[PDB]
Amino acid sequence: LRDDPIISTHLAKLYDNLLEQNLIRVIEPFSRVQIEHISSLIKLSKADVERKLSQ
Amino acid sequence: LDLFLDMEAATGQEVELCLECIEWAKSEKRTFLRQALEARLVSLYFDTKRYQEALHLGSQLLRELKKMDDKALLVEVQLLESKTYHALSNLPKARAALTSARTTANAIYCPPKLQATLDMQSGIIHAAEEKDWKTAYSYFYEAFEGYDSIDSPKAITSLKYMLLC
Amino acid sequence: PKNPDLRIAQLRFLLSLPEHRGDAAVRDELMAAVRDNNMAPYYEALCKSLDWQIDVDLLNKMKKANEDELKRLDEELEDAEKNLGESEIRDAMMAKAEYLCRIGDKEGALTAFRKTYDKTVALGHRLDIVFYLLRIGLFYMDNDLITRNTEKAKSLIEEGGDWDRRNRLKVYQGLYCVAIRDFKQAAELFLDTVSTFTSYELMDYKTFVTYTVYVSMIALERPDLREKVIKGAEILEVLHSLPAVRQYLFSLYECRYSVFFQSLAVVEQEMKKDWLFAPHYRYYVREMRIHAYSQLLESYRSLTLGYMAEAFGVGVEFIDQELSRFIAAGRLHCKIDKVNEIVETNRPDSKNWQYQETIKKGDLLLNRVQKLSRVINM
Amino acid sequence: MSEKKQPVDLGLLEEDDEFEEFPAEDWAGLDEDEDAHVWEDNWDDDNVEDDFSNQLRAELEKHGYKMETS
What single-letter DSSP state applies at residue C203?
A: B
C-alpha span between C361 and C112 (Å, rounded): 50
Resolution of this structure in Å: 4.5
Q: Which residues of C173-200 are buried (b: 16+ CB within 10 A; e: fewer)?
A: bbbbbbbbbbbeebbebbeebeebeebe
B-contacting residues in C 144-203 (Cβ below 8 Å): none
Q: Closest Cα partner for C97 from C166, C2, C33? A: C2
Do C142 and C175 meet the contact criterion of CB atoms below 8 Å apart? no
Q: Which residues are paired to C302 by β-bridges?
A: C344
| SS3 state at D58 | coil
Q: Which residues contact C81 (CB under 8 A, 6 or more apart)?
A: C89
Q: Which helix (H) or strand (E) holds D61?
A: helix D60-69
Q: How many CB atoms lie within 10 A of CB C285?
A: 20
CB contact under 8 A, D45 and C282: yes
Residue C249 C-alpha from the chain's centroid = 20
DSSP-assigned letters across all residues of C55-114:
HHHHHHHHHHHHHHHHHHHHHHHHHHTTSS-SHHHHHHHHHHHHHHHHHT-HHHHHHHHH
Question: Nearest-CA residue of chain C relative to D39?
Answer: C181
Q: How far is B42 from chain A (nearest CA, A)?
A: 20
C-alpha span between B100 and C123 (Å, rounded): 39
Q: Which residues contact C277 (CB under 8 A, 6 or more apart)?
A: C178, C211, C214, C271
Q: Kindly provide the residue ranges of all beta strands, DSSP E only, lying in C247-312, ordered along the sequence.
A: 302-304
Q: What's the CA dihedral at C125, C130, C136, C138 to 10 degrees?
A: -130
Do C295 and C255 meet the contact criterion of CB atoms below 8 Å apart? yes
Q: Which amino acid is at C359?
A: I
Q: Show the CA angle centred on residue C93, arms to residues C89 and C95, nearest 5°.
A: 115
Q: How far is C299 from chain A (nearest CA, A)?
A: 6
Report chain B residues whose CB lies below 8 A from the CB of C236: 88-90
C-alpha span between B51 and B45 (Å, rounded): 7
Chains that touch B (3 or more CB pairs under 8 A): A, C
Looking at the complex, does the CB of residue A10 fall below 8 Å from at least one CB of chain B? Answer: yes
C-alpha span between C76 and B91 (Å, rounded): 53
Mutate to test the interface with A, among C236, C297, C299, C301 (most CBs of A within 10 A): C299
3-state SS, one letter per residue, for A19-41: HHHHHHHHCCCCCCCCHHHHHCC
Report chain C residues whose CB lies below 8 A from the CB of A51: 255
**Long-range pairs for C259-263 at CB < 8 Å and ≥24 separation?**
C260/C292, C261/C312, C261/C313, C261/C314, C261/D60, C261/D63, C261/D64, C262/C313, C262/D64, C262/D67
CB contact under 8 A, C300 and A54: yes
C-alpha span between C195 and C186 (Å, rounded): 17
Q: Closest Cα partner for B149 from B122, B118, B116, B123? A: B116
List chain D domain ranges: 7-63
Q: How many CB atoms lie within 10 A of CB C368?
A: 12
Closest partner residue to C268 among D45, D58, D66, by Cβ?
A: D58
Q: What are phi and psi of B75, to 5 degrees?
A: -70, -30
Q: Which amino acid is at C257?
A: Y
Do C334 and C345 meet the contact criterion of CB atoms below 8 Å apart? yes
Handedness of CA C199, C204, C205, C209 (dihedral sign): negative
Side-chain-facing half-sphere of B67: CA atoms under 13 Å: 5
Side-chain-facing half-sphere of B159: CA atoms under 13 Å: 7
